[PDB]
């Protein structure tokens, strides 16, 4: 019924039988730049199916005690095949993203997570008079982990979950496009995120357009004898990718 | 206009329709209104939503910054300077940070006041003071002294004002490099990510310089200038959660971990 | 420039910073830009060979957008935007630098965010002259704004 | 060459004029008005339309 | 309007056309645009060139000159005078010298300030000062004293102003002998070439005289007047190379030999 | 007897009035406007016209 | 006049003032595959300007005693930026090529070389009962060198020039699309080579569609005092590149 969906992009298809309706940006479906809104003069590269296919990020295990996980996108996909190579070879680029987050469990398991995509998710440092390290902010496809308590270190991210890493209430993250995975309701959630910026195109290494956060508001809980290994896996595909400024690779 | 939705009368219902139940997991709000849960009367609600508009929320002149300068000092060091930075002020910063991106014109007002310093000098009667405020864009000549040629101001805009007149006022058009000002920047200045990280990488909005344009007088005077900002014609995009932590720095978003609400005795307690 | 025993040597180079670099800051384009804070538009560089008429050769004129440092070899330089300049009857060749920026405007001043990228030149071939001809010769470079400039 | 528009008044119980004196639009006073709202982009960002009276699932 | 040229899409080219090559020797620039060298996309460039117009470049009020006078002195010698000369100020002179010839009206603004001198006098409380600025064209009567009849001003224009009011303002129409003001003059005043050489041979624009119009008071006061110039309706001809040497004199173009650019380690160095 | 003209606005998203109060044109405010440009007198001061796509010589 | 030409592809332009008329295949200008002539079913990748730009191969010096040089194309361009990456990531691909060969010299220098592009230029081994080594056949952008005399070695290519490496007379190579660089006539030669095969698309690592050979029929000669360093340089651009069969990179 409306619980079943299938998405085909490039050479990859994801079929889901128990899912939420698809959340779409701020009501905007991703498109290519118009002549009216353009900067760079060179004819852009449009890899089409070469990069618009789905890629899978490293899976994580959901513990009953887990505080949550996050990824930054332009960085997360930097080694993802040709998407990766096209950003490694260009000064400017643009793409939207389809984010499909999966976590199946038996009917006897309970818990619930927020799946949210947040633009410009600039991070605060655990040490006040300092800035966070590059590896504390992103590890490519490896998720970073939120802390259950206040954390510390000179280049550490203040990862305490309750402030979402940025000094806001975690409970107010629902402003941003989001969807929930409630184990009694569905196995997956889908968010479509258009490119959002102050500029038509940008440098894909210096700036992370958005961060994906997975936050367990209701921790995983189960009876004994039930399966103890319950993974969360994330699969993403760029859309309408465009590149400008072909150059010596970085 | 911008009138609040009114209320439609609603009688008893016995049917298969289920406005009461939904799926929050889907990422949208319920559209349920009182007519769907209880019997209602018609209400011609004439209330408007004008104060909720973005323009009204932001168009107030906030104090952003203030500094001081004196009419006496060492080797011409009698001027104040301030790097434009709207993040040094807690209340305005908070309001502005509600939107990720914004495009607006900015109206400025200055309030200039002064006072006497403790002195042993008799005969301090002095003429009315006139002040000069000059804006130097990035890369312009810089004052190093109050009597420097850098104050000639052949191109750089500036304002001269005499005490007792209405406070100075001026309009600044939207000036970004991009199509909006960013409130947040999840990135680095450099490609090797070795420069600073965060919003301050985009802050290259110039500096104000301020001084008296009178000569010195034996009676020492200290002056204070308050700079006020009033955004106009403001269009905003992508709202964000308001901050719960108190601000620590103007150059970043570092924060002290903070709880989400004041506590109470129990979950059923009325005394919050 | 001169006759070389090796291929692919570097002729010249500089960053694209019209309002700051010593190469451009005092040229007419620089002098005007020094009265502005922000700028935008495409730029032309004209290279005029001033060697003898009996001398020939070829050069690589290239622009490398930011995100990588300046090219360290012709092999890398050639991966950017470029023109192969054949020195022949026509003495001048023009390298057009396209507008490439994440922004509509760049800063006149040096700035890390609005990074300029690099302009370099490499030999394509050797400068070849006959006997009793001086191989040592000079090239003049001229700069101006394109029609799309503000 | 002034324009004429209305003043905000209370509902369920008037014109004023406005001339621009400057050559730059940045000099104009704030664009305060009722405008319009479209909350659906934030409250209903969903591809498949939900019906208020219907079950969300199936 | 004054819109920058836009960009036309351009596909692959294989032909005898050679937009890439020219002859600089001919004295004209290349007209090559990006569509001629690389494949392009269409760009609807909406940028304008308004700030580049001559009028905007020059119409700012620059400080040109300032001087002082006192309310006490010897034998009536309490007035300031200044020969009109726009070459005494480095920033304005530089901008004006970019054009060989120019025709414009000039708007003037004065900024008048004052201060107390060190004194042993008690009881210095004084009434508000009023100042007189008078212009004397070449050949007019000249003040020799602050109380001279030369200040009657029956014809010569003048302005009287009281401190605390807005600064004085006045418009001067284009006044040249010729059809434009010359910025440069490669010639001599005399036919035997025995007078001065250069631009100062044409400078016969009159003198300003300034004084207080109050009487003296026991408390000594020193006043400073800054004169500001804002050209309007400016038409210019024949642009010139901007100066690299620093100015030495207001009366000529003598200069200290100067290099053409800051140096660097090598011709391939990125660090300039 | 005021004239009505437009304000400068941003491109790709208004009138104001102007009355003269003086008998002398020198009293009018600056003639700021887009005007027009004609760079050819400085960039192409050549008797024999060059064609952009053609060789400069012959 | 007809001696001057300019070619613009992608973000690169080559302008030549002294050149021969352009030689084009077998009268065929390179194009993309038609629906009528197709195998692979997946939607192809068309990088367009990303790969259709010019690349420059390592230059060589022309000695008065040099026997000649050669390159194999799919191998020559295997590391050439994104052209390289797209073949590294695909099972099948197709492209035509523009080959521009340059060698300038003073009017006082003399000599003449054949610039020829030869399809299926399968090489014979110097040792009869053996096969040639991979490095003896191709060194990417580094040219292989022909021998002036009969050569030897178990995995050596029988590189003697007179047999063009394949047992045919060198003087008959003119069948294949070719052009000459005669120092008294021009500085460069241009050959356009369409894709030629028994199949619509092929594997770009297992097969070399054609080999470029540069052969000095008339050796370089000059008087003393004249320039002694006279290089030959080769620049090439793929056209209408298409890729199919996106896969784990090789
Ligand atoms: C002396 C009179 C002229 C005054 C000119 C001052 C202009 C300073 C720049 C003001 C705009 C700053 C906008 C910052 C907004 C943001 O980045 O979030
Ligand atoms: C006291 C009030 C009247 C003031 C009258 C002052 C008129 C002085 C002349 C100003 C014009 C000078 C123009 C010089 C331009 C040039 O030669 O390059």
PDB file of C-alpha atoms in Angstrom, chain A residues 68 82 89 132:
ATOM      1  CA  UNK A  68      23.668   8.532  18.637  1.00  0.00           C
ATOM      2  CA  UNK A  82      33.265   8.632  -9.234  1.00  0.00           C
ATOM      3  CA  UNK A  89      39.118  17.044  -9.678  1.00  0.00           C
ATOM      4  CA  UNK A 132      37.612  21.139  16.867  1.00  0.00           C
TER       5      UNK A 132
END
